[PDB]
Amino acid sequence: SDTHIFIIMGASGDLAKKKIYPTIWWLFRDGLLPENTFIVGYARSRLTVADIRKQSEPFFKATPEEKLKLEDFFARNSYVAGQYDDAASYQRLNSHMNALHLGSQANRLFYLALPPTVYEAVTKNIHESCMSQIGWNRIIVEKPFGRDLQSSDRLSNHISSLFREDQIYRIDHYLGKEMVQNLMVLRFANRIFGPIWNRDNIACVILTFKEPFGTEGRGGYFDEFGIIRDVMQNHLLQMLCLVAMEKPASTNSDDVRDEKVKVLKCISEVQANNVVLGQYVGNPDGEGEATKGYLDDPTVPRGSTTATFAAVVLYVENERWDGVPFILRCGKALNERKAEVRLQFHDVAGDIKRNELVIHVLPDAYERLILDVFCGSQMHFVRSDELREAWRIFTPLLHQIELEKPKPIPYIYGSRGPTEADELMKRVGFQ
Amino acid sequence: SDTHIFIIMGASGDLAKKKIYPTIWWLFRDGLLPENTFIVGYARSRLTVADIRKQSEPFFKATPEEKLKLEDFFARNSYVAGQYDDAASYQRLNSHMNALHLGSQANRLFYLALPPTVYEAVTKNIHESCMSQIGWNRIIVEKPFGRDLQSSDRLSNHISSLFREDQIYRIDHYLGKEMVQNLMVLRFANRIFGPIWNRDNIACVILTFKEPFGTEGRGGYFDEFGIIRDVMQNHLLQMLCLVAMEKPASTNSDDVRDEKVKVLKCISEVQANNVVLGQYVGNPDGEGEATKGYLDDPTVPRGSTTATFAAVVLYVENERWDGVPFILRCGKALNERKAEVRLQFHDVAGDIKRNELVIHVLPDAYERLILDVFCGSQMHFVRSDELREAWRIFTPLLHQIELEKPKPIPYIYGSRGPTEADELMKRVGFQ
Ligand SMILES: NC(=O)c1ccc[n+]([C@@H]2O[C@H](COP(=O)([O-])OP(=O)(O)OC[C@H]3O[C@@H](n4cnc5c(N)ncnc54)[C@H](OP(=O)(O)O)[C@@H]3O)[C@@H](O)[C@H]2O)c1
Ligand SMILES: NC(=O)c1ccc[n+]([C@@H]2O[C@H](COP(=O)([O-])OP(=O)(O)OC[C@H]3O[C@@H](n4cnc5c(N)ncnc54)[C@H](OP(=O)(O)O)[C@@H]3O)[C@@H](O)[C@H]2O)c1
């Protein structure tokens, strides 16, 4: 219909204060949210809308000329305090939403801006209390979607034991503002160069994610996950799918996601001989944060073998791609800020250097993602089976890394990474 | 066999002194010429090898460590003086070549480093005097290959009335050192993206040749030809062919040139409504040669309407390409030194900006060209029918330009050119 209720489960938190509230404010300001939209925060800390405004408006980039729409925005805001497993608190939340103007009939969008540890409880109570009877119900869940196949399956089975898949929105938006554009142009490239992309023309494909900055005083959070879970398993794998997929049945989100899952179901589990791990150390001659290494970060626990750079070779195993190596190379604190997809060709030149086709890169990625959840297009959101296949591919390697704790290869801040990664590339065929 | 005689008809001249002798010296120095190679200059001016050495070795980049191979090179050099229509002088040349070590059996390569005005006479006498009886005979003819369809046909029929087509080498090497590489990568791109390049995926193709420098005190020679004859009619048209051509029967020079001619035979004669002409004027705020315009060049005759920039729309007319506009945009004194081929796609994006595939760019072009004439690969040399078709396409427009003398559009030194050219691009569909 026309009435929407934006619930922010965990509004007192960092993501809600620094990102969620500013982005929904920007969408409302630019007239992109539906006209009859309400925003409701929910957490345990006893707050008022004035407190959330006080702590969040610094991030709003509020100018003196848009203060009227800002007052309207905060007039459409409310806050309800309660526990995350207290049935009475969810009853109070449900009644408060039912009290809003034509709130009964309204579509409800729940942003689970909460540590995943509590998701279980929340997804239960929301199911039995706060769901809508008429309007649709959509849940936005956040990283981490587990850390291995077992945890991710238990969490995904719990969530997909209460809400249908067309109600679950797994959002990933921390790798830049051009992520959605990355995936869009890669899908367009697959639709265009479909007939050319075979094992006959291509000898090797690469997917690169370089960032020239380190952890920057926040390596503590990165340490618990690693560069494989942060970049490769979710993003680089999704665009590998987008590259290697067949022509979808249509332009429905579900058909192209079916093709992505069909691609994932052909990638066998990666093993350590096809993997090079690296950790960045301080540059002695550079200046600034380049002088500090990974272990020199105050937040990083000492003795951490966590890889901040990974080069991994995968193989799609069907008739279209066989023996064609997909080299996923990503790493923090490198030489450039580059996200590219290069496909090297079988040369045939008769002559009496290898050629490659390269793919580089109004609303930002996160803004477009929220607006997509509003429209209901699950295009840029990973599905349950897609996530399960990705975790299946990368979880034996990850279990080995956790058990044996292999020391990563040291590479210098600003370098391209270990030379052993380039050796691994040479092994399967490259430049 | 193993013995080669490099005749330089017109060795006293500018091209021979500044380019031909240095490049054959570089080939001999790098061991690329056949071991039993002799070089023979021929002109009317009474010279000795010492004189040619005196006037040409400045351009040799001679270092003190290669002086021995340089002495050997000039030992393999000789010079014969005589007129260009004197039968006795050609008899003396033929006898002198027959006197060289096993010169009778030797392959003979004639470089017609002469004004085309005399080619006729030369090609006659060489035919009846200096050709070899055993070894092959190959002629290198130079620009201009006529200035319109009639002159080019009379010259080409005269030359192809004495030497078979596998003996005629029309060389064009003045547009940079990467021309051969341009054509090679474009042929590879056609062989790869063959199935994609249809009227169904592509809405517009462009071929760009920008140069940031003006005429530089030598606009007098450029005035007699124009930017259409200098860049478009020969080079941009050849790479248009390379883009739009079908899959050749093989990798023989003649099969791919057959495909290029088949492409040319489908381009009807261009008319002035699809053409934008421009002339560059001095930049008032820039410095250096940018302060001087085209007419401010001392060599340029005043009142010259000669276009130094051209934007021309052509159309291949078959089933693979129909209504697909090929926009050939070239010009001196522009913003960049760019040579690109961009193909814009029919977007289909459903959504609740147009994409394009872009193609940019050991021996230099001219060096590789001479070495090709030695090997005998007529790949990067225009054929008689190819040249005739190009002249047919561009000669009615050129005749109109000569008759009516239309004033070109003034554009500033360093600019991208006339805005009317971009209007013409918009008319048929672009960005
Ligand atoms: N790159 C990434 O993977 C990435 C980056 C940023 C955020 N995230 C995800 O985004 C979500 C938002 O987290 P955040 O970083 O913005 O802030 P947060 O402090 O983790 O959580 C926000 C709210 O969660 C509640 N909370 C926190 N720990 C809790 C616990 N142990 N038990 C019960 N309630 C608890 C608190 O609400 P009250 O005390 O007011 O009740 C807090 O204000 C998380 O799930 C996080 O994983 C992921
Ligand atoms: N971008 C271009 O299109 C371009 C650029 C450079 C060169 N070229 C071509 O390259 C060729 C070489 O010419 P060049 O510029 O290097 O020098 P050139 O001075 O034009 O010719 C070299 C020799 O030609 C003879 N010659 C010149 N004019 C003559 C005439 N009217 N009658 C008889 N003999 C004559 C002279 O030999 P002697 O007096 O010793 O007998 C002279 O030393 C030309 O055909 C020119 O078109 C084209």
From Swiss-Prot, chains A, B:
SUPFAM superfamilies given in the database record: Glyceraldehyde-3-phosphate dehydrogenase-like, C-terminal domain, NAD(P)-binding Rossmann-fold domains
Reported impact of V361L: In CNSHA1; Alhambra; class I
Outcome recorded upon mutating R392H: In Kaiping; class II
Residues reported to bind NADP(+) 2: R329, K338, R342, H360, R416
Effect of E128K: In CNSHA1; Ilesha; class III
Consequence when changing L369F: In CNSHA1; Telti/Kobe; class I
Active site: H235
Effect of K143Q: Inhibits catalytic activity. Does not impair dimerization
Membrane-topology annotation of the record: Peripheral membrane protein
Outcome of swapping K353E: In CNSHA1; Iowa; class I
Result after altering D153V: In CNSHA1; Santa Maria; class I
Swiss-Prot/TrEMBL keywords: Acetylation, Carbohydrate metabolism, Cytoplasm, Disease variant, Glucose metabolism, Hereditary hemolytic anemia, Hydroxylation, Membrane, NADP, Oxidoreductase, Phosphoprotein
Role according to the record: Catalyzes the rate-limiting step of the oxidative pentose-phosphate pathway, which represents a route for the dissimilation of carbohydrates besides glycolysis. The main function of this enzyme is to provide reducing power (NADPH) and pentose phosphates for fatty acid and nucleic acid synthesis.
Note: Binds two molecules of NADP. The first one is a cosubstrate (bound to the N-terminal domain), the second is bound to the C-terminal domain and functions as a structural element.
PANTHER family: GLUCOSE-6-PHOSPHATE 1-DEHYDROGENASE, GLUCOSE-6-PHOSPHATE 1-DEHYDROGENASE G6PD
Protein name: Glucose-6-phosphate 1-dehydrogenase
Recorded name of the encoding gene: G6PD
